[PDB]
């Protein structure tokens, strides 16, 4: 009795009783699986389509095809032949899109204003119906892909990824190179007279079949309205009845096992990777055997494998569990980072792993463990935070390929039967004879003889000697390991407290003392049993010089290192914390189920106040911290650019260079002395937000205060005697340039900042609307058309109460060239703005309005919004509505005069600074530009300029 | 064979062989005594005339007449009838004048450009020849005198001064009131039909006789040229042959002795004053009996009376010795300040004094002591710093009344015969039966029954009970007192080191390390055996908050308290030091004979590095420091004004209020911990200047460095990681006002500041030339004519590399009235500047030029000049010549446009701040003024304004 285009309708989708969204699953006649989500409150609608095809289906001779195909779909269809019709449509309607390609999936997703779902969905639909694959774009777009590959080339994590593939069965599609590059997608095909367009076409035509598609749509419309919409657009996707690709034979056969790999890293990291090929456990998902094992082997704290490796001083962290491979095969991994001692005892570390493993084989599957994970996952599912539409649809679209419509939401959370046999079955794979081992360290440099061809990774490959293997097999039973004890952080009280009669819409100051200032709001819209607790501890000793900065950091690092064990239970139990040093002191934040927060917070605080440093932990953390600093040189050029601009523009800021040099002066006794000093006088400013009453909030603050007082004899620090850092004020018509060399990458990174003014309602919206207007043309001009690089970013930069327009680019091309093109782009944006209809202009205002008014869907997000106002000392909780009202009054002329005053090459109030990070080895008309003054010493540079006021609060 | 106008010529004046000035003494026929000083290098010439008449010669019914007469002489003579002819002449020729009246002297003095000595001396001469005593001025000027008295009314030191007089013989002229006021000089005389003008005339005519005059003149001209000059102008002063006043009978007879006075102070001070009437010892000056006694009784450190009173915790400081009375009588005094314990043990303190005294009577005069003082004074005289002309002439003119022409310079330094009998004679006066005692404390408030009539001082007068007196008489011998041991700081090496081949004209950076930066110059022009050693120790812990500021202060106070004893010998031996906390850390400076500097510096440094705090000293210093803070409220309104403007204009600055509140949190353990922290990391910047070689300079720096390293394990602090404080940048056309109440005085104090710009050669000279131009009209308009108060000051204000025009006034009238008159004055200065000849304008430029180019005459002064450049981090050692060259290029138009740009009521770049300090109880056309924004919170005020850059160094 259905619409003839619908094979089946699932009207009972299992969801959480907490979830007010309405859900209907469909199975279209053409095979498409569909989850429709009706949310009448949502400000943004969203859709995602997942093609169950990916890079593993690339033709042998055109590796990267499935990825290039992804890129191309954005760039024109027969119905919508404009190359950025899609992206320009989304931009002008508060929307955004993205997509990715893995081995078996290509997932495309967008969100958009709820009033324009049909229009966006319609343009989106055409990708799977009538792409153009325009030869004009094909040549240009290949660059973005190549640039995207070059982005990753020097990234350790992408290097390892690809190298594990090149070390398997060469025959197996697992071995193929996914990303592609100019060579694979252009050069090699041309040498050999192969038309990659005929190929994109043939690919799209053989694999882009309705029977391998899954869709998820979230809108305001009724499930019924949505159903007709989806059928209307998608029911006519051709079903090619292509068989779902399958990979039964494991890419790692015997001649690939019992192998050792010595790898040269880009960063100076010490890492041990231990891998076991396992069968695909996807089918056994309602008992989840690999995670049961992942949970135990990767467990942290008391008795765990990690505690031990930590105590011996070999390893700092550990990750264990199941790793996805592809339909037919998976991996089970144990990865750890190595201390200097660790690197010399790899063979024993591996022995200790097998001992832990042995204990499990002897002990057997534990009913209670599985039952505890089960109980946790269930609470997690029921009280799961409301998701952002874009991430939610994209995720669901992916999940539809693996689970019944009615189980698509609960799958991967809700376990059912315990299956001891399945656990045992996997456990049997975990053996020396089945192991691959990879050591990553610069202590291998110069002494490898192999180059992976896509990344150029340097490595040695050798067989683990039998005497070793056998030692591992003969791994006995270490009485030092032992099973996790019961989780006592498991929440039990989920009662949502009645809203108090006094409850406020925004956080209210309910305590204003010398020692503590306390902002509190009781949750009035999400109603989950969660709280967010944030504390900023202010002390001048935290940032007085590079040495105290180094000392505050190491103090927290060591505190966290000391708490891990105990806190790991809480983390499993959905109760998490973060602790970090700031330029004002320390930042402590607790989030999760409110129930047992007092227990963790009390322990955290008592801990800081009574901290006794272990000498060995100290020396290890400090070594790591040292490497961490040096390691910054291996970071992306664009991240260097953003880093130095930050340091440049703030009154006081210690560089990684200053910190490294002052680090040697840090010693255990000096640090020991430092702690009490740091703790002796403090001011605290807090936001306690969620399922809590005023009464409870104050009780929490008091525990924290009184704890510090009794254990570190803390006394108040008057807020008025706390210095706050100002932003550097650039001169009218000034242009400064700061130049550094990136010693790792062959791309340069540039950040161009045009300082405007102190933040205020008017200035903010001039800036943000101008940004909104150029946001997508920036992408379309500098990346799509000019193809200057994969990383091309424009937008608002805010700090220390000041703001301005920033551009960020990572490019093969040099900084002075980027500059000109950016300036060439600005001229263009001006004219485009003059020649803009009042209608296109109103769209943009409406676009930015929806983006700003789009409310947080969860507590932690709303909490972070509030925390931003507190941290900045602006306390502007109604900022969104006030700022959007002003925004709607702006006209084209407002924006023109703004640009001419602050942004034009010849603007009287142009305040430009550029940060050029040079690659290791270093069209529309661009204007003539002044000669920049070049900064050689950041300190001198700041001394010779004025500083801004601090923003007034509300 | 002399000029007939000269009775005698002394051509052998005893001077120091070091002194290149030429000296001739004359005795004019008319009785005038004269010292002529030829100095061909001097940039400024100078004269002083001392009339051996003062307030003790005031007529009974017009007290203050001799003082009013002084004032009036400045205001017109028959030859030069213009009321400010004199002062305007000096101003326009780089000169200045002042005068004072004591009991027996009226001393008038001026300096002026060396090229205009005759013209100035000529106008000056007329004061003693043909004053006008103009009725128009007489009425106006009385105000200045009254205002001058009101300035002093609330000053404890002037209150006590006058009260000791009102407590003597009422018959004796000593009892008269010196300053005068509107009442004595106008009101009472009018009630009783007495013409004070007939009186000024009669006074001048009976007492202003050549036979009571002494003159001293210092010029470039030859002694012969000077002789003719002096005779020309002064030989015709009428000799009235008036007998020199004499006061043989002591103003304190028996019925005035054995008295006790309980006095109520304005400040909260605890002071004990012990006084003995002695005979006049003026005649015994070449053995100096009262100073021999003054030296011993006032001695500090080992064995001394003070050490003991200190150890018992009663007294913090002590002053003892002879005090001038007037021809015929003197006093011998012992004054101490009291701790809280001290105030309850006054009677025992006094007993301990008499015990020390007893020891002296038993021990008898000590030949070696007198001989040691003798040797010291002789070195002091020989190596005396070259004096500034104005202070030198004024002093000499006074000295001529007491000593042979040929002994006028050496007198009071060079002793001759030891006279044991004279010592004994004075010592006999020092007895309980001859003592007056005065306790000054707020613990007397409300319970006195006497009012001194001139100051209104509140006090009780009672007779020391005989049982007490007798106890003092029965004072035995305390074995705890003991005679000063030999002074080992007595210098012995006076060799002046040859100037090195490399010697530089300005200090040169001869060391530039992480830990120490060292500026050094070898003296190339004074050639005395002296050095100046200045160290600024930089540490952030010194000013991080009010508590650390309080802690750095108390640390130094206690260090100095602990060193006194040991260092007092060095001080006697012309080797002095200063130690004080600064906003950047600590400041240490040593000056004097270079010989034994290393000994003192070594001891000072070792001391800081190894300081062990005594608990009792701590509690006492801290009490004092507490009182010190509160006591600030009793300071002059104009000093409050200058104080709050300073705090207002600097980025960071703790108020006396913040410091008092944070003081309670200071404790011995907290302070003990603070010291090592403070000393652990340091940067040092030093100027070592004088009779020292490069080699020696570096050796001194190294001792200081290595001392700290070995005793407080100091490590370097990178100069680049040291934050420096910026000045607040006021907005264009802004006007802020900060208002406070002075709770003691009945005058208000105002400081008006017009911020101009960052310092630079051009800006500096615009400012200083404008100041030079208005300097004297300011005085003549606001004080002389408008009579707004005694304190009326205009000039340049410099700080944190910024500058501006400041006006300071203390007035009966309210702040808003002062403001208008000041603004009324500015309009006037503008027109006056437009209507100014190029000739009057060039004079002003030439005036300011001479003032700026006038070189230091001694080492410590040149050293302070250099230190200013270092402390400010401008290092502009040639500043004077460079700035004067620019100054000579300026024109009237330059100054006009400057005024219109920065200073006019409607100037676009007017940056005005005012500080109004309200009295306890609160014509040319003034412009309309804006409504000021009023500052209620200095902190908020600074946060909302930008900050200036720091000046670039050279
Ligand atoms: Zn891509
Ligand atoms: Zn006077």
Numbering used by the authors:
A (entry chain A), B (entry chain A): 42 to 963, 980 to 1011
Article sentences:
Insulysin (EC 3.4.24.56; also referred to as insulin-degrading enzyme or IDE) is a zinc metallopeptidase in the M16 family that has been extensively studied because of its role in cellular insulin degradation and amyloid beta peptide catabolism. IDE exists predominantly as a dimer in equilibrium with tetramers and to a lesser extent monomers. It is unique among the enzymes comprising the zinc metallopeptidase M16 family in that it exhibits allosteric kinetic behavior with substrate peptides increasing its activity. Crystal structures of human IDE (hIDE) complexed with peptides show that the enzyme consists of four structurally related domains that adopt a clamshell-like structure enclosing a large central chamber.
We report here the crystal structures of rat IDE (rIDE) and a catalytically compromised mutant form, rIDE-E111F. The structures of wild type and E111F rIDE are very similar to the published structures of peptide bound and unliganded human IDE (hIDE). The four structurally similar domains each have an α+β fold and arrange to form the same closed clamshell conformation as hIDE, with the N- and C-terminal halves of the clamshell connected by a single polypeptide chain. In the closed conformation, the two halves of the clamshell are in contact with one another forming an enclosed cavity, and the active site of the enzyme is accessible from this internal substrate-binding chamber. Bound peptides are presumably not seen associated with wild type rIDE because the polyhistidine fusion sequences are degraded by the active enzyme. Comparison of the ligand free rIDE structure and the rIDE-E111F structure with ligand bound at the distal and active sites suggests a likely structural basis for allosterism. As already noted, the crystallographic thermal factors for the first two domains of the ligand bound mutant are consistently higher than those for the unliganded enzyme. This difference may reflect a higher relative mobility of the two halves of the peptide bound enzyme, which would be consistent with a weakening of the interface. The observed conformational shift at the dimer interface between ligand free wild type enzyme and ligand bound rIDE-E111F reported here suggests a possible structural basis for this communication.
